[PDB]
Amino acid sequence: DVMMTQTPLSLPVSLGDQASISCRSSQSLVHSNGNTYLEWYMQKPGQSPMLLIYKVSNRFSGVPDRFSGSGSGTDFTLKISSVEAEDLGVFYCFQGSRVPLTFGAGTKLELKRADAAPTVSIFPPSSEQLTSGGASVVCFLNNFYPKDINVKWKIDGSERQNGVLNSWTDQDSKDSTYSMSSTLTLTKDEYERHNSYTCEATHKTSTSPIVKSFNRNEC
Amino acid sequence: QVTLKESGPGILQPSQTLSLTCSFSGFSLSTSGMGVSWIRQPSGKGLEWLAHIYWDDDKRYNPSLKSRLTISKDTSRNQVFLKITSVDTTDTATYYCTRSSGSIVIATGFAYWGQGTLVTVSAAKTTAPSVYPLAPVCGDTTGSSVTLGCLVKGYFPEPVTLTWNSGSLSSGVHTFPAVLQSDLYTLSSSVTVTSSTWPSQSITCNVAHPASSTKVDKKIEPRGPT
After folding, report:
1. Neighboring chain A residues of B130 at a CB cutoff of 8 Å
2. Are both B191 and B180 inside the same structural domain?
3. How far is CA A53 from CA A50, A116, B92, B212, in A?
4. B54 Cα to chain A: minimum distance (Å)
5. CATH classification at residue B103
């Protein structure tokens, strides 16, 4: 298959900025005829993809002159000369030369804002869940920027990796932040075998980590 | 002017046959240069092209699914079909149908797309959510605002809907996308309210799982020492 690679996979943008995304294919896209079939589609959340640019450099009918495409053979670029809000979403390059037809994995154009530290909240298992045999410890890490964050669970000062389920929101519409939920699921028995529970966040807003911890027995 | 609409069952078990329909308007399938492709997107992930059928009933498939795929047409009825045999878990996706530019040579220019239909393939049985209230640590934090939570664990299928105080507690709320724990789904939600609000007033998490006709209310209540 032809392998479309896009760079970067995420692009933080301020409204008004110029934006450039590259698409490198694994092999030349020139046909038996001289015309190349390299396209750029875009997709907004909850919506279907939309065609933007075709034959490397040609805008689809009704696609603003801010959307510019250029390149040949193996490296391609898409340019947006002044990013507007409606431009935010995911961009895919696409080849229709050889079967199977393939898309790149996408480039998420996202909104830039000032760094923010996450508001971390840790939650012990509910007594209702314990009664049923399970023990979930949940950690909310809310309203942070940039979206790059890392979560570490520690039990009695020892790192725990297994049984951890993470979930991340989409960038918020009003405050441009991101939030994350991280759940550590144990058996009730394992939960009770230990005391100290710590959710640890590492995020560029501080050299020192934000941690929330609780101790099972004494509260 | 040009519209496309996809339809089919939203849930199948592994090994079953998925039969999808693309119903369209604004162009006809029996004119030169017209083509209809099926493309799918797993949640979060990228698009994957599946099959293309031409104005002249010429066809083209993804070789990586070829033995399971059959693209078909009812030009009279404005209907394009796809048949996928032996469904497995990884056939879980939104399936789109789309017509090409409409000029002459067709593997490109997908300008018009349907809405997409969600097909989920699972061997899981319908399961009501377990809903647990998440009270702040059994401690004494003195902050101006307080964060509470609600854990919705072990349900099939999606969706669940989650409100607070019957939708009348709306802001300070982060409700996270479901994640799939072992055939079963789980999600959580947080609220941040003022400390003068809670526990002084009632905050309850409201969870509906339509598919199983369940509604659960779970009042967040201060923890005890045990």
Report:
1. 129, 132
2. yes
3. 10, 36, 29, 45
4. 14
5. 2.60.40.10
